[PDB]
Design a protein around this ligand. Structure first.
Ligand SMILES: Nc1ncnc2c1ncn2[C@@H]1O[C@@H]2COP(=O)(O)OP(=O)(O)OC[C@H]3O[C@@H](O[C@H]2[C@H]1O)[C@H](O)[C@@H]3O
Ligand SMILES: Nc1ncnc2c1ncn2[C@@H]1O[C@@H]2COP(=O)(O)OP(=O)(O)OC[C@H]3O[C@@H](O[C@H]2[C@H]1O)[C@H](O)[C@@H]3O
Lengths: 196, 194
């Protein structure tokens, strides 16, 4: 049954979408996950985490709810050298309660240049190591695209025994022509199948 | 007992940056050791060190972040997030019974200014009938709040005894070492927590 997902991602740019449009996508994806009775773990990634929070708080507070209901589990990363020493252990810890991991975007500024986000790759590896189903949203580009290609290349390793609907939905995760609503509905239906 | 840890900083009064970070780290670690839980809003200059101190204790004692000894509520940044900040603060402080205030400064209009968000969290704490622990020795908003409470002491700590009054005074003693200031804070919280 629908349980807890890890929502992985970071961004300073959003492939073919303007920032405000990608923010709406992340906000509405997070809201729809809540409305479908999922819980979310988020590491508050730059360019992503704030909009996850925004979508969840909209749904909670329209219902006089509370962040203490643990629909959204927040694990912001400690910044600086001491913090970085714990990031691997912290990731392995925070992913434990999740069973499905979703990957979005994955890019950051390093030395004044936009580069791929290795932390999203690390979260993919950790997720797979505990036998989570992984959901790389290739249409969002960057690491998520690399991960989508990796999974596509060894599909039966990641989704053994998948049915035709799963295969179609997986392909649509990489369809850059889909609207926000169409891409969200693809992700949600795929994650529901993987949770059931 | 669950405490709200309020604070933000881009500078740290008289202290060397790493020493102030270590103070925040060690305060958080010793709160965990003395069996408190912490709610943190992940304030700039503060939140990372709260996390560092808690993780150090948890991960040397076979612990997990899921035991909710440290409850994290990072703030959504941007215009939409700002619209929810007051409701988010009132929400996250609800489960706490005591609030601690550290530092409280930020950049505004190119300048280091006192952090109004820490003042807002003080007012919410008071409105929810939390006890307040303003660590005046850390300067900035926390010192303003220490002075305010000191001037209206019986409003905030009715019926306090000599020991409580001594500890409250020591919260503003800038001569104390890191460990002495931490011990003052936690012994005061222990009184306020029953
Ligand atoms: N001032 C900051 N304040 C708060 N948070 C920050 C800041 N600056 C960076 N962050 C975030 O720290 C994490 C560790 O950094 P990182 O591993 O180098 O980042 P990444 O490679 O982009 O990985 C992305 C994945 O890690 C996590 O968020 C990353 C960064 O977004 C999420 O779980 C992502 O899914
Ligand atoms: N890029 C950022 N990433 C993450 N977090 C950030 C960033 N930039 C700012 N923050 C934090 O947002 C909160 C709202 O901001 P604010 O109200 O303007 O801040 P403040 O006046 O300094 O209040 C301080 C109190 O608020 C909360 O953290 C503040 C800021 O530190 C805590 O609970 C404090 O105890």
């Amino acid at each position: 049954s629908n349980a807890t997902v890890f929502l992985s991602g970071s961004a300073v740019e959003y492939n073919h979408w303007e920032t405000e449009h990608a923010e709406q996508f992340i906000h509405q994806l997070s809201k729809e996950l809540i409305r479908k009775d999922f819980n979310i773990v988020s590491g508050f990634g730059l360019g992503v985490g704030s909009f996850v929070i925004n979508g969840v708080l909209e749904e909670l507070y329209m219902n006089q709810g509370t962040i203490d209901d643990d629909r959204l589990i927040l694990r912001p990363f400690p910044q600086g050298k001491k913090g970085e020493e714990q990031w691997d252990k912290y990731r392995r810890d925070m992913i434990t309660r999740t069973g499905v991991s979703i990957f979005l975007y994955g890019n950051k500024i390093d030395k004044g240049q936009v580069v791929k986000a290795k932390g999203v790759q690390s979260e993919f590896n950790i997720s797979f190591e505990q036998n989570n189903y992984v959901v790389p949203v290739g249409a969002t580009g960057y690491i998520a695209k690399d991960l989508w290609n990796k999974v596509n290349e060894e599909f039966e390793t990641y989704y053994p025994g998948a049915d035709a609907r799963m295969k179609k939905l997986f392909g649509e995760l990489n369809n850059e022509a889909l609207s926000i609503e169409e891409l969200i509905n693809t992700i949600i239906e795929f994650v529901e199948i993987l949770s059931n």
